[PDB]
C-alpha cells in the first residue's frame, strides 16, 4: 500500500494530487508542481483520460502492472518512500478496504456529521458525532462508511484550498524562535472550530515546511477566529523530521513545551483564557488579549 | 402558464408621465394576465445599504458557506425536493371552495368594481388596466392554489384573506396607482390661499368645520377632499393626527 489519499476509492490522479507527502515533495500548490506531475504521468505511460477514472473501472492490465510501473518510474522524482506494506480486509463479495482508508473515514466522520450556550452546544454535538462514529464500526452498516469516505474527500479538498491560499499570501511570519501564522480572514472558517481539523491543517503545513531547504526546526503556533464568540483558538505544533530519515538521528522525539508555557503565562498574568482541553497544547484566548499574550510568550523562556 | 418580463417605454416608469402613454399593451392582452407587478426603483440609501451588503455577501467567496447553513438548519430545502413536492401536490390534491368564501369574494369583487368606476368617472378616460370577470376567476384560482399548497381538500377564510391581500397589492400597485395622472387648478390656489391666511402655524381645526365652510362656498366636497389630501401629500405644512379629526399645520 502507498501513502495515498483514498487510493481504492478515488481516481489515481486525484490521489497523487491530494496526497500530502507528494504535495510536500513536489510543491503542487504552484504551476511547476502540476507540470512535474504531468511529466511523471506521461513517463509512466498512463493516459490522462485513463488516470482520471474510478479505481473499479480503471484498466485491469495496468492495475496489475501498477507495482512494476511505480518501481521503474518513481526513482527519478525520488518518491520511492511512498511504497509500504499494509493490511487489507475483505468480506465476501462486498469489496476491499485498507486500514489507512478506514481510519481517514473515521476521522472525517468525527470531524463532520449530522457564549457559554454556544460552547456547550458545540461540545455536545462533538459527543453526538463521536457516538455516530462508534455506531459506524460494526459490519452491518456501510452507509455510515461511504458517507465518511465522501466527507473525507471534501474535507481534504477544503484543507488544500485553504493551505494554498496561506502559502500564496505568505502569512507565515518567521520570528526569532518560533514561526507564527494567523487566519484573520478567509473562506470556510467555520470548519476550523474543531481541534482535530485544525491539527490536520497544521500537520499538512508542518509537512510542507519540513520539506524545504530550511535547516531550522522551530515550533509553530496557529490561530483561528469564530466571530460568534470573538475568540481565537490557538494550537501549538512541534517540528517533524523528514519521513525518509535514518533511525540514528531518532534518539528522542521532539517534545512539546507549549502546555507548560501556556500554564506559566496564565499563572503569572490574568488573561481571559480557558484551558480545558484534554490536549494541554490547545487553548482558547480572547481577540483583544491575543497580541500582548503572544508578546509574553516571545519574551518567556521556552 | 405564462410568465412574462417586460419593460415600459422610456425605460424608467416615469411617473410624471401618465400611465396611459407609459404602457403600449392593448386592453385585450392585459386582461388575460391576472397578476401584473410594477417593479419601481427607489432610492432611500437604507435599502441601498442592505442591497449592497447582500450582493457583496452573495459574492462567491462567502455565500457558498451561508446557503449551506440553510440546508443544515432546515430553513430552506433543495431544489429537486421542491420539484418532487410540486409534482406530487399537482397530481394528488384539487381543493374546493366554501359558501362563506364565495360571499366574501362576491363582496370584494363588487367593491373593486365600484372603485374602478369611481376612478374612471373622475379621470374621464378609460383605464389603461381593466377589471373584468376574468379577475374574479383569477382570485378564485389563487385561493385554489393556496389551498392546494397544504393539500387541504377544502379552501377556507385563511387562504381567502391571503389571496385578496395579494390581489389588492397587485392591483393597487398598477391600476389605482395615481389614476388622475397628476375647475382645473384655479380653485386649488384659491383654496391654499385662504387656509394659509385663516389658519396659522401651530394650531388645528376640525375636518367637519372645514368641509362645511368649503361646501358652503364654491369649493364643495369633491374638490376640497382631494385638495386637502394632496396638501397632505405635499407633506411640508399640514399633518394629520388623532384619526381624521385633527388637521395639524406643522
Curated annotation (Swiss-Prot), chain A:
Additional note from the record: Present with 1730 molecules/cell in log phase SD medium.
Subcellular location: Nucleus
GO terms of biological process kind: DNA replication initiation; double-strand break repair via break-induced replication; mitotic DNA replication preinitiation complex assembly
Function (record text): Required for initiation of chromosomal DNA replication. Acts at the origin of replication. Also has a role in minichromosome maintenance.
Protein name, per record: Cell division control protein 45
Similarity comment text for this entry: Belongs to the CDC45 family.
Quaternary organization: Assembles into a complex with MCM5/CDC46. Interacts with MCM10.
GO cellular component annotations of the record: CMG complex; DNA replication preinitiation complex; nuclear replication fork; nucleus
Keywords, in A-Z order: Cell cycle, DNA replication, Nucleus, Phosphoprotein
Organism field: Saccharomyces cerevisiae (strain ATCC 204508 / S288c)
One GO MF term attached to the UniProt entry: single-stranded DNA binding
Keyword Phosphoprotein carried by entry: yes
From Swiss-Prot, chain B:
Function of the molecule: Acts as a component of the MCM2-7 complex (MCM complex) which is the putative replicative helicase essential for 'once per cell cycle' DNA replication initiation and elongation in eukaryotic cells. The active ATPase sites in the MCM2-7 ring are formed through the interaction surfaces of two neighboring subunits such that a critical structure of a conserved arginine finger motif is provided in trans relative to the ATP-binding site of the Walker A box of the adjacent subunit.
Note: Present with 10300 molecules/cell in log phase SD medium. Early fractionation of eukaryotic MCM proteins yielded a variety of dimeric, trimeric and tetrameric complexes with unclear biological significance. The MCM2-7 hexamer is the proposed physiological active complex.
Subunit structure of this chain's protein: Component of the MCM2-7 complex. The complex forms a toroidal hexameric ring with the proposed subunit order MCM2-MCM6-MCM4-MCM7-MCM3-MCM5; loaded onto DNA, forms a head-head double hexamer. Interacts with CSM1.
Gene giving rise to this polypeptide: MCM5
Signal peptide: none
Cell compartments where the protein resides: Nucleus
Protein name: Minichromosome maintenance protein 5
Full protein stretch here: 518 to 773 of 775
Native species: Saccharomyces cerevisiae (strain ATCC 204508 / S288c) (Baker's yeast)
Motif Arginine finger, residue range(s) on this chain: 31-34
Domain of life of the source: Eukaryota
Family: Belongs to the MCM family.
